[PDB]
């Protein structure tokens, strides 16, 4: 249903983990660059973790594309979803976490009426 696109290529699927985030608990996994003078990671010794850098940039024709082939868009109520009326083939709507179940029902009903794809048509569904 999505607009046709080339094959999706990422060049690096592994999340970049902060050095020694696996060794000390106080070192969070959020990536920080090592500014040490004798740090092997900064000196890029063979056998150590790879640092994030611009060479891993994604293809501009592929950037921000979901595996389904759409660009994700956050929606908060019915009025926002009407901004995607003529853009079904490229954008997909996603209900914000802070949306009540009753409002989610009408959101999903409207999206199905207009053929808008919904990434999470299961949030807060009672069954």
Partner 1 sequence: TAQQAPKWYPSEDVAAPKKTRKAVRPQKLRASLVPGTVLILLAGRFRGKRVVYLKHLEDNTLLVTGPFKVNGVPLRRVNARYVIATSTKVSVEGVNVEKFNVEYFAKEKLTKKEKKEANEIKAERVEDQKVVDKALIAEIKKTPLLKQYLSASFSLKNGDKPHMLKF
25 belongs to the binding site for Mg ion (CB under 5 A): yes
Distance CA 5, CA 74 (A): 22
Distance CA 102, CA 104 (A): 5
Q: Applying CB under 8 A, which part among 13-21, 49-57, 89-97, 108-116 lies near partner 1?
A: 89-97
Distance CA 117, CA 104 (A): 14
Cβ neighbours of residue 11 closer than 8 Å, sequence gap 6 or more? 56, 58
18 belongs to the binding site for partner 1 (CB under 8 A): no
Please give the residue ranges that form the binding site for RNA (CB under 7 A). Answer: 1-2, 8, 10, 12, 14-17, 19-20, 22-28, 30-32, 35-37, 42, 44, 46-50, 52-68, 72, 74, 76-77, 79, 94-103, 117, 119-120, 122-125
């Amino acid at each position: 249903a999505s607009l046709p696109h080339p094959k999706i290529v990422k060049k690096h699927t592994k999340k970049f983990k902060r050095h020694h985030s696996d060794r000390y608990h106080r070192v969070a996994e959020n990536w920080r660059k090592q500014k040490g003078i004798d740090s092997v990671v900064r000196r890029r010794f063979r056998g150590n973790i790879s640092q994030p850098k611009i060479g891993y940039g994604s293809n501009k024709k592929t950037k921000f594309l979901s595996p389904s082939g759409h660009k994700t868009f956050l929606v908060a109520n019915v009025k926002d979803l009407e901004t995607l009326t003529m853009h079904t083939k490229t954008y997909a709507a996603e209900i914000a976490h802070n949306i009540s179940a009753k409002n989610r029902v009408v959101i999903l009903a409207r999206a199905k009426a207009l053929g808008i794809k919904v990434t999470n048509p299961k949030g807060r569904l009672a069954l």
